[PDB]
Amino acid sequence: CDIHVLWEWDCFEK
Amino acid sequence: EVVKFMDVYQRSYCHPIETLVDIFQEYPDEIEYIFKPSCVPLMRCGGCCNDEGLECVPTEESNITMQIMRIKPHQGQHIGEMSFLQHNKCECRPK
Amino acid sequence: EVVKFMDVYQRSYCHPIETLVDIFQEYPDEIEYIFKPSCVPLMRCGGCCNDEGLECVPTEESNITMQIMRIKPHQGQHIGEMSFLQHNKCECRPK
Ligand SMILES: [N]
């Protein structure tokens, strides 16, 4: 989950 | 009746968004004159990034030309072309 | 290759437009928190009235609720509903 790119869901929950 | 998280996060993430800009904002040295319209719609990078250390900056730009009216006091009415900077692509980068 | 005057005038004239607003501006009593996303898209009055004697103000408003992620020190990551003010109608009115 790179910080410079738009995230998907799993980047937030885990 | 409640916007779900992923819809909000994706809709607000750094991207080009139509922004209404006052022409004096772009060209402060022309505050002496009167323009019609006084503001123009421009695509400019907007939104937030995943971290406060990053910022939404353009990675592709271009000029757009619009028909604007300008008039000086007690003088003739002019209509002509004015160019404005537009943002075509945006990315979250270190500031 | 040129936006025509009437097109520029209509699109820039006072009306509700999708604006990207920082949550801190809307919840000043919660500036301790870190929000994700840190900004939300909201309908807000924007544009110009083409007369220095007039400004673009909301004449009708409503609420919208969104899922926002919240965290502060001594606390873990929460997800909660936050309500925001939206502008449904705008008109040009004396300053
Ligand atoms: N994670």
Author numbering:
A (entry chain P): 1 to 14
B (entry chain W), C (entry chain V): 13 to 107
What does the paper say about this structure?
In the present work, we focus on a class of monocyclic disulfide‐containing 19 amino acid peptides targeting the Vascular Endothelial Growth Factor‐A, the main pro‐angiogenic factor in Human. We proposed to use this peptide as a model to rationalize the thermodynamics of α‐helix stabilization by an i to i+4 lactam bridge. Although only lactam‐bridged ExxxK, DxxxK and KxxxD induced the formation of stable helix in the unbound state, all peptides of the series were helically folded when bound to VEGF.
For the peptides 1 c and 2 c (KxxxD and DxxxK), the DSSP software identified residues P9‐14 as an α‐helix, although Trp P9 O could bind to both Phe P12 HN and Glu P13 HN. However, the NMR structure calculations did not converge into a single conformation. The backbone RMSD of the 20 lowest energy NMR structures, compared to the co‐crystal structures of bicyclic peptides and VEGF (see below), indicated that the bicyclic 2 c and 3 c were significantly closer to the folded structures than were the other peptides. Helical folds were observed in most structures for 2 c and 3 c, resulting in a single α‐helical cluster for a RMSD cutoff of 1.2 Å. The overall analysis by spectroscopic methods also evidenced that 2 c was the most structured peptide in solution with 3 c. However, in our data, the stabilization of α‐helix by the lactam bridge directly improved the affinity but did not correlate with an entropy gain: the affinity of 4 c was slightly decreased despite an entropy gain, and the binding of peptide 2 c to VEGF exhibited a less favorable entropy variation than peptide 2, despite the high helicity of unbound peptide 2 c and improved affinity. An explanation could be a difference in ΔS°solv between peptides 2 c and 2, but the ΔCp of both peptides did not evidence any significant variation in the desolvation process upon binding to VEGF. Moreover, the apparent inconsistency of entropy changes in peptides 2/2 c likely results from differences in vibrational entropy due to the cyclization constraints. We propose that the vibrational entropy decreases when the flexibility of the conformation of the bound bicyclic peptide decreases, i. e. when the free energy well is narrowed.
